[PDB]
Design a protein around this nucleic acid. Structure first.
Ligand SMILES: [Mg+2]
Ligand SMILES: [Mg+2]
Ligand SMILES: [Mg+2]
Ligand SMILES: [Mg+2]
Ligand SMILES: [Mg+2]
Ligand SMILES: [Mg+2]
Ligand SMILES: [Mg+2]
Ligand SMILES: [Mg+2]
Ligand SMILES: [Mg+2]
Ligand SMILES: [Mg+2]
Ligand SMILES: [Mg+2]
Ligand SMILES: [Mg+2]
Lengths: 52, 150, 261, 180, 68
RNA sequence: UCAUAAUAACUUCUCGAAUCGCACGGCCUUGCGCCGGCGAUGGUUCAUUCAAAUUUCUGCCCUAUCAACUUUCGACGGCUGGGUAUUGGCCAGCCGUGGUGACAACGGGUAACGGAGGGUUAGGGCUCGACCCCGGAGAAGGAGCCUGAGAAACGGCUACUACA
RNA sequence: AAACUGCGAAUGGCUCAUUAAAUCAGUUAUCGUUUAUUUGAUAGUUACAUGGAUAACCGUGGUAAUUCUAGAGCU
């Protein structure tokens, strides 16, 4: 396809599964702290509720 | 009416949805429930003739023991022809008013009605008819009562 | 004629809409809905021609797009919505409620009502029977269907509707001595007490009423709408539908004029 | 007599003009959708087998698969047929189409390459035309890049870099709206 | 006579005026400018003239080069 | 023989939601866990609305130099089916011989679309009504049909005749 | 923008050729039928999401001629 060169498509499709597994764990982790940040932001609203 | 036999035709004549061959015999007062002859009452103060209840004729156009309901106008008349099969012709007379000359003239119309085997109709008789659904090309009425002779 | 019609010619509209014969060639042509086409009150005509809130059509259709006006507690957004007898129309921004009822001359009139009483209705029942699954139900004159009604309730009666939960709080039997208002025929706006009823087998019975002023009149059952036994539940408009003849109508008109000034 | 030759694999097409009839003799009496050998056409076509895809008459009428005649016949073309696009639901218009048996009367043939040969074509098989866009459904993307049930398909999607006209700022990225 | 009668509208806010008041009166008062358009017949001619082109009718000069 | 319920079975066989937008919420076994609001678009049956198609009774100008008409190849009625959204001589088979008329049938004329109504006045009448309201029919003359809830449609298609 | 899909295009407007129980008028029936739409009720016998095409589009043609169209590559 025009967007991706032949080398890109082969390497992308042929990425090793072990690397994919690591990629999954890496991707999930930032979302996990971001969700914990979501509770921290909710605590920020909780502090606003306490203030007023 | 005068009918020699009830089953004198190519097919077999029977009332629809009336079960007639049951192993167990049960006696009930209801007309159609037990398996014997079925009949209804039209209404409008019209009494079911006695000959209908014990008669054996089969007719799908009679208001009694039939599948036709009566609704609409009720008319009366004089029979003029009853010499065909299960249908009669009655004659109705009235007066039309001409406004310019301040007087009337007679006029008449002819009507076709279905007659049930329950009644016996002769020439020059009073009958009362009721409207029903189209039964033929030119038949839309059914006889209900025959008035006594003078 | 190759399908259903969608245009209505002026000079053919119902008389009680009170539309001028000039200033245009067409009429609102009310859309299909819960009420009969012949005797209905289109929302556009009511808002624009009677209350005079909207000058013309363009902002008249804008009003419903703002969802300001509602009928029976539910907002309607179509200009040609068929309103009818006993329906309640509520405008919250200005803060009042209206009920559509005939006057003594046979046309709809404006009638202020209080907020606490403007939250219920009542309607005559058209048919009662059991539906699918053996569940009994009834339908009234305003296409209200209600399941599990009181088994004693029969046809031609009237029932009070909450209009918020649709539950059958109360009802009125149809018998002699009740107070009724006529809804069809030439006797538009009359209110009377049932004197006695005579029936004809085969359909099209007639009923005889008697007014408070010892007047007498008769009408078909399809045009009688019982609204109470005594002390009618709803608030009647001014004049109570007594149909004074023209002689006293002119006498009272001059008496009121001289009394005021 | 023109020839429209296409290579689906490389996405490349070309048009050739042929005026010598004995080279075109072996195409005669063939049917639509058949297989033919291109050896008599010329030395550069050795080892090539072609599929007959269609053609046009001198008058401009198209060929229709399934009608056996060397002349042209009138038909009542309904909706769903090949050479008719109705302008209204259920409307049918009578048109004229030419049969599917090849003959000397037609003006242009259209055909495609089935099997690559030993020789190369100077202007047909030496270039490849990029596909304009890529897959748009989640299942298709997963099947294409051979992912598994849980692999966060959201990251794996083709991106094309587009830029504005002359604002002087950096270009941005646009995405294909994964469906389902 | 020397008396004259007309109609008046009073609005709560100027923005409320422009939200509900018709445009042509705005042009009458000078608050808003008029809209420039071609005649009704020329517009009608254009709309039906573009019914003979299929796809991307905005530019249709690609078929001018077919004659060579 | 209604609404509705129950039993024994059947079906190239249906429907019972793989759709979209705003809001950012609440629980503890803290898992990218569970629950939760208001709208749009659809969907089986009943009711309603706009209707549509058939249908009962009575009412239309002049003419007898039009007095008997209808049933070859349905004209009147009975029965069994087919077809239609349904009744019905609407159609296919079998069996009877009927139906209308001097109270004007049948036929011929109409410079005849029907009605609400216009003109003219003691009263009674005579005459007009293509035309703004209601109903019916047609798109040069005949027939046939697709799509669609709805058309025998013509600013939809097919064929013939005559023009072009 | 373009294009697929949905709805409407069977309403309006014009004319009076045919038509003498035919159309039409007032009055009845549908327990003899169809019904888009609107309105109100109403249906417990891989699932964290199934499968192939096609339009728009790129690029190449035929005919003096029309809102005529072919074959090839994508979603
Ligand atoms: Mg019309
Ligand atoms: Mg009745
Ligand atoms: Mg039959
Ligand atoms: Mg005789
Ligand atoms: Mg004529
Ligand atoms: Mg007229
Ligand atoms: Mg027509
Ligand atoms: Mg036609
Ligand atoms: Mg035209
Ligand atoms: Mg038209
Ligand atoms: Mg004429
Ligand atoms: Mg609904």
């Amino acid at each position: 396809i025009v967007g991706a060169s032949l080398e890109v498509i082969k390497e992308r499709r042929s990425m090793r599964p072990e690397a994919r597994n690591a990629a999954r764990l890496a991707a999930i982790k930032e979302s996990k702290e971001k969700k914990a940040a979501a509770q921290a932001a909710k605590k920020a609203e909780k502090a606003k509720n306490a203030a007023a | 009416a005068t009918e020699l036999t009830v089953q004198s035709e190519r097919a077999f004549l029977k009332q629809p949805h009336i079960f007639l061959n049951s192993k167990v015999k049960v006696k009930s007062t209801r007309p159609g429930k037990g398996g014997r002859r079925w009949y209804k009452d039209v209404g409008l103060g019209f009494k079911t003739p006695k000959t209908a209840i014990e008669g054996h004729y089969i007719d799908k156009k009679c208001p009694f023991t039939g599948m036709v309901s009566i609704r609409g106008r009720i008319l009366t008349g004089r029979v003029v022809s009853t010499k065909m099969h299960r249908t009669i012709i009655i004659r109705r007379e009235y007066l039309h008013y001409i406004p310019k000359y301040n007087r009337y003239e007679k006029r008449h119309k002819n009507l076709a009605a279905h007659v049930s085997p329950a009644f016996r109709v002769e020439e020059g008789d009073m009958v009362v008819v009721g409207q029903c659904r189209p039964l033929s090309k030119t038949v839309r009425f059914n006889v209900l009562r025959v008035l006594p002779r003078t | 004629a190759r399908g259903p019609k969608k245009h209505q010619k002026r000079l053919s509209a119902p008389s009680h809409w009170l539309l001028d014969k000039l200033s245009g060639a067409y009429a609102p042509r009310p859309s299909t809905g819960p009420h009969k086409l012949r005797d209905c009150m289109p929302l556009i005509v009511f808002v624009r021609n009677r209350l005079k809130y909207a000058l013309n059509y363009r902002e008249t259709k804008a009003i419903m797009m703002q969802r300001l006006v509602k009928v029976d507690g539910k907002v309607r957004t179509d200009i040609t919505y068929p309103a009818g007898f006993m329906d309640v129309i509520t405008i919250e921004k200005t803060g009042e409620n209206f009920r559509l009822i005939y006057d003594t001359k046979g046309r709809f009139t404006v009638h202020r009502i209080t907020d606490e009483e403007a939250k219920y209705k009542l309607g005559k029942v058209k048919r009662v029977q059991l539906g699918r699954g053996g569940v009994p139900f009834l339908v009234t004159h305003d296409a209200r269907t209600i399941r599990y009604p009181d088994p004693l309730i029969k046809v031609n009666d009237t029932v009070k509707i909450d209009l918020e939960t649709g539950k059958i709080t109360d009802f009125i039997k149809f018998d002699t001595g009740a107070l009724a208002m006529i809804t069809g025929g030439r006797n538009m706006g009359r209110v009377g007490v049932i004197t006695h009823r005579e029936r004809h087998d085969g359909g099209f019975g007639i009923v005889h009423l008697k007014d408070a002023l010892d007047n007498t009149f008769a009408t078909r059952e399809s045009n009688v709408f019982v609204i109470g036994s005594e002390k009618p539940w709803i608030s009647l408009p001014k004049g109570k539908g007594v149909k004074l003849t023209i002689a006293e109508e002119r006498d009272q008109r001059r008496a009121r004029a001289l009394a005021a000034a | 007599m023109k020839l429209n030759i296409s290579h689906p694999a490389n996405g490349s097409q070309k048009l050739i003009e042929v005026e010598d009839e004995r080279k075109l003799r072996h195409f005669y009496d063939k049917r639509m959708g058949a297989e033919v050998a291109g050896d008599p056409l010329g030395p550069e076509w050795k080892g090539y087998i072609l599929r007959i895809t269609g053609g046009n008459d001198k008058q401009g009428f198209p060929m229709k698969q399934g009608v056996i005649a060397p002349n042209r016949v009138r038909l009542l073309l309904s909706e769903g047929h090949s050479c008719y696009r109705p302008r209204r639901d259920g409307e049918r218009k009578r048109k004229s189409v030419r049969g599917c048996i090849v003959g000397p009367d037609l003006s242009v043939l259209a055909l495609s390459i089935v099997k690559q040969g030993e020789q190369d074509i100077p202007g047909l098989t030496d270039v490849v035309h990029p596909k304009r866009l890529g897959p748009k459904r989640a299942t298709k993307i997963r099947r294409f890049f051979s992912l598994s049930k849980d692999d966060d398909v959201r990251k794996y999607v083709i991106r094309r870099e587009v830029q504005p006209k002359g604002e002087g700022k950096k270009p941005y990225t646009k995405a294909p709206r994964i469906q389902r | 006579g020397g008396k004259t009668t007309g109609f008046a509208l009073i609005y709560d806010s100027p923005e409320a005026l422009k939200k509900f008041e018709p445009r042509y009166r705005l042009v009458r008062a000078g608050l808003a400018a008029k809209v420039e358009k071609a005649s009704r017949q020329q517009r009608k001619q254009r709309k039906n003239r573009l019914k003979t082109l299929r796809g991307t009718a905005k530019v249709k000069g690609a078929k001018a080069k077919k004659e060579k």
